[PDB]
Amino acid sequence: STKKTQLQLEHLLLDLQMILNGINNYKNPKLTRMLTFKFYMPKKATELKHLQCLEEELKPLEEVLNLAQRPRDLISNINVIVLELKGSETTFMCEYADETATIVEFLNRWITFCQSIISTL
Numbered sequence: 001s002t003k004k005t006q007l008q009l010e011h012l013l014l015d016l017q018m019i020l021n022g023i024n025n026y027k028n029p030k031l032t033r034m035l036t037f038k039f040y041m042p043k044k045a046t047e048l049k050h051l052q053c054l055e056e057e058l059k060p061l062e063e064v065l066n067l068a069q070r071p072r073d074l075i076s077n078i079n080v081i082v083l084e085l086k087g088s089e090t091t092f093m094c095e096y097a098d099e100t101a102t103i104v105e106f107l108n109r110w111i112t113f114c115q116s117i118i119s120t121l
């Protein structure tokens with residue numbers, strides 16, 4: 001049961017890392033223009049329920065990946081995982097920081113998130 005969550009988290013981590021690795025391969029008029037896109041960062045992200053704050057920024061993530069290229073299926077998969085992991089009991093009320101982030105900073109935040117949860121179970 002916890003292993004099921006652990007494996008789901010492992011796929012999530014890997015999916016985010018794939019996107020991040022796919023970002024370094026780009027040119028220079030692509031990378032610079034891509035980094036101007038601003039993402040919302042969660043004020044608090046320490047437990048599984050906070051993955052709502054990932055779901056709520058998948059649309060801009062998919063948007064930015066489409067303008068940089070399938071991205072539809074990778075983000076689709078992240079959604080499926082996130083929906084499973086976030087729990088279906090109550091909707092978590094997401095709070096975001098005043099300082100926005102690049103796509104790199106955004107990914108690095110959620111990569112650090114997954115690794116932190118995996119460590120605690």
Ligand SMILES: N=C(N)N[C@@H](C(=O)NCC(=O)N1CCC(c2cc(-c3cccc(Cl)c3Cl)n[nH]2)CC1)C1CCCCC1
Pocket residue numbers: 030033034035036037038039040057060064067068100
């Ligand atoms: N849904 C959001 N995360 N909201 C942000 C949002 O609406 N994003 C917009 C944004 O960051 N833009 C608008 C589109 C701009 C753009 C960049 C590109 C582009 C063009 C060629 C290649 C590539 Cl990869 C890209 Cl990303 N096309 N258009 C970049 C900056 C706002 C957050 C709060 C402050 C204001 C932004």
